[PDB]
């Protein structure tokens, strides 16, 4: 059939080949995948192995000695074939970072180091059970606007030259670097940010701005459960290490409230590690932004006037 990999799993093999390119190598060995996962922030490959026991130091040092003895590797082709064959076997949950652990256990070259380190084969079964129950979270829960703009699938924006040019000046400032398209539900708010992404690929934006545009889907984050903290923190973590500007449609619904979700965006917008583009209604703008003095310090009032005839 056909296999489907996420953007995080796709860049994993690319980042593993980048580290192996500096050590003079011509093939990509599956042992380079475990090295990259052990150098991330709040990784899942370490917490899962801690429940089963063993010694990660003895396993990490064993994987680093395999890549040195190296002269697409023949052992890597078996990993890609197992990801396509075992893609219709278990139950729910697609592909992510925790599902790649079981793929490396089926390789005979990787199973010998695990058995000689501590965590055997039977310990890996009970370890992935308790943990069970654009990047990875930016593909299913977010929609990149620059991807649809460069692919010729975006409607042209004509008549917003006096508004798009003002947002660029706001993003170039040190403070108050969070624009908010304050207008009315009928004068145009989402289409304004559509024209900004068109000037990014063409190169009309200054050199001080080189980020992307990601449309944060509110209805996609509320799919299912409790479990909302695991989905909101995953989006903020991917946007920090990649440096990108996220777009939030109707900020009065997600920022200011059932499940508390506005608490995870306050420390990010205060330290300058996050840039958001608001587009709410003036009716609800005076009850969620101007009411809190801490929100006015980072958001700037951007009026959207209805065009004439």
């Amino acid at each position: 059939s056909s296999m489907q990999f996420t953007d995080k799993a796709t860049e994993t093999l690319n980042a593993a080949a980048k580290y192996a390119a500096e050590n003079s190598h011509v093939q990509l060995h599956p042992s380079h995948v475990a090295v990259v996962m052990l150098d991330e922030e709040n990784s899942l490959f370490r917490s899962i192995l801690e429940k089963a026991g063993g010694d990660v130091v003895s396993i990490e040092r064993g994987f680093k000695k395999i890549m040195v003895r190296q002269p697409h590797s023949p052992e890597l082709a078996k990993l890609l074939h197992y990801a396509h064959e075992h893609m219709k076997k278990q139950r729910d949950l697609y592909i992510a970072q925790d599902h790649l652990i079981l793929a490396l256990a089926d390789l005979p070259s990787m199973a010998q180091v695990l058995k000689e380190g501590g965590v055997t084969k039977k310990s890996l079964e009970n370890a992935v059970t308790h943990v069970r129950g654009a990047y990875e979270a930016l593909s299913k829960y977010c929609i990149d606007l620059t991807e649809l703009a460069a692919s010729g699938k975006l409607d042209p924006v004509i008549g917003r030259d006096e508004i798009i040019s003002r947002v660029i000046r706001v993003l170039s400032r040190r403070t108050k670097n969070n624009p908010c398209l304050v207008g009315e539900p009928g004068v145009g708010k989402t289409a304004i940010a559509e024209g900004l992404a068109n000037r990014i690929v063409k190169g009309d934006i200054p050199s001080s701005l080189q980020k992307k545009v990601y449309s944060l889907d509110i209805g996609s984050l509320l799919a299912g459960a409790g479990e909302f903290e695991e989905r909101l923190k995953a989006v903020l973590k991917e946007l920090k290490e990649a440096q990108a500007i996220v777009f939030i449609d109707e900020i009065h619904t997600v920022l200011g409230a059932a499940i508390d979700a506005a608490n995870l965006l306050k420390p990010m917008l205060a330290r300058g590690e996050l840039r958001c583009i608001g587009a709410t209604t003036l009716t609800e703008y005076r009850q969620y932004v101007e009411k809190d003095p801490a929100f006015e310090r980072r958001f700037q009032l951007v009026m959207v006037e209805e065009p004439s005839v």
Partner: protein, 191 residues
């Protein structure tokens, strides 16, 4: 339309090997067939002597949608704003007689706001009808929207029987929200 989207994606992602066969081959060789069918279709519609405005969206096609979502006849849509201010004195005299000195004073306050002889800080025309009762105060308002506004039902009536108190002054708000939905409205101040 799909070929223009795939051609622009290859030129932006550093791929000048696939878009070279779309903008230079797949598109220039197909524009001649599409333009040929559109020219032969327009010539065949004139031979039938009917349905000329059934395939090209023109001024008469837009007026059909507006006339359906409201109820105004089509004959009132083709009347421009310039021709309405010229034949205004002859229409008001056919319904309201006797007040020859009052009809001329109404047109003198509206024509001075449409040509450009006054600053854009005042509305259309502020009136103040007086005189005894039964002289032509209510009928004159109904005849104004039936010619200039082309909508007799778009006349709001805010009586002072319940808005006389000081607590109802802030709702002049109910009157502010009502005039926002309908721009061309007639605000009548009775009593």
């Amino acid at each position: 339309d799909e070929l223009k989207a795939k051609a622009e994606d290859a030129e932006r992602r550093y791929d000048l090997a696939r878009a070279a066969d779309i903008r230079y081959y797949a598109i220039p060789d197909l524009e001649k067939r599409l333009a040929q069918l559109q020219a032969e279709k327009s010539q065949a519609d004139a031979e039938r002597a009917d349905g000329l405005l059934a395939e090209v969206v023109g001024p008469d096609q837009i007026m059909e949608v507006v006339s359906r979502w409201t109820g105004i006849p089509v004959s009132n849509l083709q009347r421009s704003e310039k021709e309405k201010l010229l034949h205004m004195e002859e229409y008001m005299k056919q319904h309201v007689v006797g007040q020859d000195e009052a009809i001329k004073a109404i047109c003198d306050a509206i024509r001075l706001s449409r040509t450009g002889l006054q600053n854009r800080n005042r509305p259309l025309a502020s009136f103040l009808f007086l005189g005894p009762t039964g002289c032509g105060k209510t009928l004159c308002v109904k005849e104004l929207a039936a010619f200039l506004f082309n909508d007799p039902g778009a006349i709001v009536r805010i009586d002072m029987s319940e808005y006389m108190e000081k607590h109802a002054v802030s709702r002049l708000g109910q009157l502010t929200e009502a005039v926002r939905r309908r721009p061309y409205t007639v605000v009548l101040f009775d009593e």
